[PDB]
């Protein structure tokens, strides 16, 4: 939709779902919380934390915040040449340029998440907090600056940005 990458129909990658209440002043919260990541395999910055009165709405709200006001990010399937050294809120990730010929190893739900995120081959092991919410931020904060250049003139490319910077 709009300024978004060439996804076709939506990814519906639900990682978690929960229900939270203080129950301090007028009974419990009936509302649910939801975690969803939406990519396209080619690179997106889509990540959505949402909440609603009930579970169907919590997930659908969370997915809506994951597909609106997202830039397309233009990496070549699973290969990327310029990641960022990811930090997001104490949860730390460390991607580097890499073959896709080697495959991807990751425990828990992360080998299914990294693939729809399109950043799976470049990833290397996390450190810091192991919260689900901020560990998957590899394709969001790890692309806040990036390129994946295919031109043979790649080292005169930054030269090309400089004479436009004059």
């Amino acid at each position: 939709a709009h300024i978004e990458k060439q996804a076709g129909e939506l990814q519906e990658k639900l990682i978690a779902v929960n229900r939270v209440s203080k129950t301090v002043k007028g009974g419990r919260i009936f509302s649910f919380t939801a975690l969803t990541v939406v990519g396209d395999g080619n690179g997106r910055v889509g990540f959505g934390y949402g909440k609603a009165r009930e579970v169907p709405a919590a997930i659908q709200k969370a997915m809506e915040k994951a597909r609106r006001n997202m830039i397309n990010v233009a990496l070549n399937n699973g290969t990327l040449q310029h990641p960022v050294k990811g930090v997001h809120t104490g949860s730390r990730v460390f991607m580097q340029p890499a073959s896709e010929g080697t495959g991807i190893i990751a425990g828990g739900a992360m080998r299914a998440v990294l693939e729809v995120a399109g950043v799976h081959n470049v990833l290397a092991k996390a450190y810091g907090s192991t919260n689900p919410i901020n560990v998957v931020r590899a394709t969001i904060d790890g692309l806040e600056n990036m390129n994946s250049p295919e031109m043979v003139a790649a080292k005169r490319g930054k030269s090309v940005e400089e004479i436009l910077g004059k």
């Binding site: 040449q81 310029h82 050294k85 340029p97 600056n145 390129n147 250049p149 790649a154 080292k155 005169r156 490319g157 930054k158 030269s159 090309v160 940005e161 400089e162 004479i163 436009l164 910077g165 004059k166």
Partner: protein, 129 residues
Amino acid sequence: SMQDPIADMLTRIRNGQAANKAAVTMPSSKLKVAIANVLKEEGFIEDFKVEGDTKPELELTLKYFQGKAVVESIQRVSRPGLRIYKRKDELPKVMAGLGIAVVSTSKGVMTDRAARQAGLGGEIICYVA
């Protein structure tokens, strides 16, 4: 007090770009000129000047693309006490060659691609990210 002068050149390039400054000045040296030429042509600086009959002095103009900063960091890797030397076959690859390593060979300061192409090694001076 002054313990690394290519680190001081670098932080001036970094901070120059963070404060939107047009030019950045410091004392000059032979290493600083040989680098500033490789930096001009690969456009990691825009231009430079050299001046002073009494003592030499270095004037530089920053890298842009659109008008606000586009270089994340420029940091030195071989330094006072951890000098790092690389052979011809093990010269690094910096961001699939979208970035540069600036490389002092026995034949001078050049990029890692011309250093590889001669088949020399040497001290690998400073990296972009």
